[PDB]
């Protein structure tokens, strides 16, 4: 036969998150994910672990049992995760900032983030709330407090991209996630707005949306396939940016992963279904063109890291 000679004219750009020896690189591939037989896969996809600035009340009981004496203090929580599981990066989700719940001033949350970033070596990704209006004020204060560590600000949608991008990349020399809603054109639009504002592809990463397996999952898969093919096959300069998809945010909130044995006796264990839900979701998005995923359960990280290592080595 004839070996498939697939030549792509594009190449994904590299974004560096963090500082020091623990800084990680994203992107750089000129072929489809895990296609070591086609060419150069730039940087191995990274796996990150999620923590909260408040005590996790809605997390499953097995997760609460792991983080017993460290969940109360985010500073202790971040150091516990770094020393025990050594994640590529730690995601700090500011749950206390959302107006829908225990709404708190942006100054309070930035003070929490300041202590965390100065207590760990691993790169930090500060995840904001769902509200576009609050994230503009929240990230302005957070990026000011945590200056000099090159954090990643997450969820900068078209609404607040001016506020988040300015207070992020341009002012305090951080990285920003440009988030769209499971569309290539919307992903292409937000990237153009960042470029026109003065932020080139090396300073922001892309979030084309994420979903749990079985809950609008094929929409995320199609978007990831389309952006990867356009960036490489069509040499689209406005899509040659690395992609980060938070899996634990969506995969761990579903009925199939949160229901315990009391609620659904036939479904079996709860911890197994929670880990199996994140592993399935993360593996599928990794194969579609995601350069970094965020996971919650420590066991999911070990499986995904082995999953990445087996395919690349």
């Amino acid at each position: 036969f004839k070996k498939p000679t697939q030549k792509f004219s594009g190449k994904i750009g590299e974004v560096e998150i963090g500082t020091g020896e623990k800084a990680l690189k994203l992107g750089g591939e000129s072929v489809l994910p895990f296609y070591t037989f086609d060419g150069d896969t730039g940087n191995t996809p990274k796996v990150g672990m999620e923590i909260l600035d408040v005590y996790p009340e809605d997390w499953i009981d097995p997760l609460k049992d792991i983080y017993k004496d460290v969940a109360k203090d985010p500073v202790k929580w971040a150091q516990f995760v770094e020393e025990k599981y050594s994640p590529d990066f730690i995601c700090l989700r500011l749950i206390s900032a959302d107006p829908n719940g225990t709404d708190a001033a942006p100054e309070d949350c930035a003070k929490t983030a300041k202590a965390v970033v100065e207590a760990i070596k691993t790169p930090l990704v500060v995840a904001g709330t769902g509200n576009h209006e609050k994230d503009a004020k929240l990230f302005e204060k957070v990026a000011q407090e945590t200056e000099g560590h090159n954090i990643l600000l997450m969820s900068a949608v078209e609404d607040n991209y001016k506020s988040v991008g300015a207070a992020g990349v341009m002012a305090y020399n951080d990285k920003v996630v440009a988030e769209s809603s499971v569309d290539i054109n919307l992903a292409k639009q937000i990237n153009i707005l960042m470029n026109q504002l003065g932020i080139d592809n090396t300073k922001f990463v892309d979030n084309v949306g994420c979903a749990a397996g079985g809950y609008g999952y094929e929409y995320v898969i199609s978007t990831l396939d389309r952006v990867k093919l356009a960036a490489l096959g069509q040499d689209d300069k406005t899509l040659q940016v690395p992609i980060i998809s938070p899996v634990s945010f969506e995969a761990c909130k579903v009925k199939e992963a949160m229901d315990s044995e009391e609620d659904s006796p036939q479904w079996g264990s709860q911890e197994d279904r929670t880990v199996s839900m994140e592993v399935a979701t993360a593996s599928g998005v990794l194969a579609s063109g995601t350069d970094a995923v965020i996971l919650r359960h420590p066991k999911s990280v070990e499986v995904i890291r082995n999953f990445i290592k087996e395919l690349l080595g």
Partner: protein
């Protein structure tokens, strides 16, 4: 002394003062003494921007005087004048740097002197997001303290960051202006050279936010001209040094406004004696727009309130309908005829009808002016006016042109709702949504029966003529740019709609004019310009640029396309089309079927069966999904013979386009009743039956050349 000589004289005086103060620094501190500004990474920003050199000791400060000397070339050309302004800026920076060398703290409060880098990063985010609309550099002295306080507080109330140089600092203190970084009133210093401290803010904005390396002077000047919305208000008598420093502001793209008689330069150096208009003059000169957060109406305003129902017995006033005459109009007029935020109620107000619910004439004339506002955007503004009025509680507007009628509920009136509030809603959000094409908006609400009829005949009726004539008489040959829409790629990734004046979108809701306005309002939106450059084939609609721009938008899925044919590289279809035309080879023509038609076409396939192959953004020769208006177009299959290829249409569909289809076929010279020759569902449904019907009818499609 002309403008050039005044600037050169000022620059020489600035150089003379810089040399004198540098000599003092050398004599008192020596050339090894450190030179620095408090808390900055850019050394002396102006010199670093112009040359890329960082100055650290006094000896290098003395060597920076050669930069000032090399920037003063006394030749009366504009470039030399701008360089001489920059010479004053460099000299002023050297003077300020020597101030910090000579005296440990050279500025005493309220003056702040140099502005540190963390402050710039603190106010940089509001500068990018527009929370700070601009920077008002006020220097000199006003005729009185209250005049200065009024102007300064006017800028402050508008959210602008104002910087103060000279005696206006004392005048503002006498006028009791609250000064602070959070209050956006920063006094820099009493000396003219202190204006360099706001100049370095713009320079370091290019260095920090623009990411421009030092020494790239042209890039930095370009950045400050486009990105930093700064302007200068020079009050009181102006010395040559002040004028030369102003030439430095002009060199950075900052217009200079003054109350003094000067050799005015359009858009750059302007005289405005009227202190009551200086703020508005500066905002116009710097293209600064201030946004209004709140609609100034007592009745609640939200998108949720539309679609409500006013009880038949709880109406207050019913304007328009078949009852009385009501109309609306959006005009594109010159800036002279439009005065910003003018609401005029002509006739009795709503408070006059205290009796039972009655009817009054209503005339809503809206005048809009802007730099890039044209007559093609008027329908877009007028369409949105329907939803603007429906968003108000107790007010519901339905209709267009003179077919409109608005009813007012009791709930609004008891809360002080008046006809003046009608113009407040339109004006406040006409500037909001159409913030890139509407500069000024003037709204007049006419309710006098005599005037309502008169103004309609001179503004409303004549302008509706232009809208209809423009839409009807515009053809593909006249236009020079097509438009491409890709809003249906969410489910048909390979689909690109090419919109021409004679071929609108498949969904039928996007036309050439609509896409033209979509591109203007939303430059990064779904509609983008498609140049009609490079004509491979005129009859089939093949263009070199169209093929280039289709393969780019579709991400390479579709490379070659035609606009006026269905056999050779046809356009793709998404799935929003209401009518699909399919080729019928045995009849030497094509068959059509609409979405609502649930029976079987003579092709043997229903609409659903045909839509399963035509749609999805795939190029299927012989089948094309299109709109309901494209049927009666002169470009409907121009390359396949023309309009006469239609042989079978649904009875309901044929009636709808019968008037337009017959007129278009009249250009083909056949008898006018072309729809009479077209077979329908009632006559027959099978292929062999319809062919016999066409044989007896003398249908033109049979006589034409073989389509396939």
């Amino acid at each position: 002394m002309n403008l050039f000589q005044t600037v050169f004289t000022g620059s020489k005086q600035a150089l003379a003062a810089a040399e004198g103060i540098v000599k003092q620094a050398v004599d008192e501190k020596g050339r090894d003494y450190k030179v620095a500004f408090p808390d900055t990474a850019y050394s002396l920003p102006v010199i670093f921007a112009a040359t890329g050199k960082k100055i650290t000791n006094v000896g290098e400060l003395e060597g920076a005087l050669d930069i000032v000397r090399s920037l003063i070339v006394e030749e009366e050309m504009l470039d030399k004048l701008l360089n001489s302004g920059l010479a004053t800026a460099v000299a002023a920076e050297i003077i300020e740097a020597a101030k910090y060398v000579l005296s440990d703290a050279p500025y005493a409060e309220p003056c702040v002197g140099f502005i540190s880098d963390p402050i710039i990063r603190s106010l940089g985010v509001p500068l990018v997001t527009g929370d700070i609309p601009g920077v008002a550099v006020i220097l000199g002295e006003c005729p009185d303290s209250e005049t200065a306080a009024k102007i300064i507080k006017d800028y402050q109330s508008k959210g602008l960051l104002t910087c103060l140089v000279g005696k206006v600092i004392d005048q503002a203190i006498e006028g009791k202006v609250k000064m602070g970084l959070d209050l956006r009133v920063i006094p820099l210093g009493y000396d003219v050279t202190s204006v360099i401290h706001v100049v370095t803010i713009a320079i370091r904005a290019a260095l920090i936010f623009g990411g421009i390396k030092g020494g790239q002077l042209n890039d930095i000047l370009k950045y400050t001209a486009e990105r930093v919305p700064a302007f200068v208000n020079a009050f009181g008598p102006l010395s040559e040094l002040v004028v030369s420093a102003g030439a430095g502001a002009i060199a950075l793209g900052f217009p200079v406004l003054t109350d003094q008689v000067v050799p005015e330069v359009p858009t750059l150096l302007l005289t405005q004696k009227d202190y009551d208009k200086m703020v508005k003059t500066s905002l116009e000169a710097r293209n600064i727009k201030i946004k209004i957060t709140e609609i100034p109406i007592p009745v609640s305003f939200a998108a949720a309130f539309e679609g409500e129902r006013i009880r038949k017995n709880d109406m207050l006033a019913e304007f328009g309908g078949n009852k009385t005459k009501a109309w609306e109009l959006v005009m594109c007029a010159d800036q002279g005829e439009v005065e910003d935020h003018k609401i005029e109620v002509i006739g009795p107000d709503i408070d006059t009808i205290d009796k039972a619910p009655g009817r009054m004439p209503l005339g809503m004339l809206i005048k809009v002016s802007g730099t890039n506002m044209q007559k093609d955007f008027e329908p877009v503004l007028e369409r949105r006016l329907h939803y603007f009025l429906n968003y108000i509680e107790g007010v519901m507007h339905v209709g267009q042109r003179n077919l409109t009628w608005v009813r007012i509920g009791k709930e609004a009136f008891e809360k002080g709702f008046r006809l003046k509030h009608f113009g407040e809603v339109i004006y406040a959000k006409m500037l909001d949504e159409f913030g890139s094409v509407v500069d000024k908006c003037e709204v007049t609400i006419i309710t006098d029966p005599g005037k309502a009829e008169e103004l309609e005949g001179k503004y409303a009726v004549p302008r509706y003529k232009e809208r209809d004539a423009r839409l009807e008489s515009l053809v593909d040959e006249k236009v020079d740019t097509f438009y491409s829409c890709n809003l249906c790629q969410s489910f048909a990734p390979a689909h690109v709609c090419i919109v021409t004046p004679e071929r609108l979108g498949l969904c039928g809701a996007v036309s050439w004019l609509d896409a033209k306005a979509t591109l203007e309002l939303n430059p990064t939106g779904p509609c983008q310009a498609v140049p009609k450059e490079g004509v491979v084939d005129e009859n089939l609609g093949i263009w070199e640029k169209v093929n280039e721009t289709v393969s780019k938008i579709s991400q390479g899925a579709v490379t070659s396309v035609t606009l006026y044919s269905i056999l050779q590289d046809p356009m793709t279809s998404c799935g929003c089309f209401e009518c699909i035309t399919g080729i019928m080879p045995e009849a030497n023509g094509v068959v059509m079927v609409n979405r609502e038609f649930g029976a079987t076409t003579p092709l043997g396939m229903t609409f659903g069966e045909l839509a399963s192959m035509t749609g999805g953004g795939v190029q299927t020769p012989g089948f094309m999904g299109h709109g309901r208006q494209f049927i009666a177009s002169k470009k409907f299959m121009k390359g396949e013979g023309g309009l006469g290829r239609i042989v079978w249409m649904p009875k309901e569909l044929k009636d709808f386009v019968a008037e337009k289809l017959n007129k278009t076929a009249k250009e083909l010279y056949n008898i006018d009743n072309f729809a009479d020759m077209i077979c329908d569902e009632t006559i027959a449904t099978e292929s062999e039956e319809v062919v016999k019907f066409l044989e007896e009818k003398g249908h033109p499609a049979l006589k034409m050349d073989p389509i396939m």
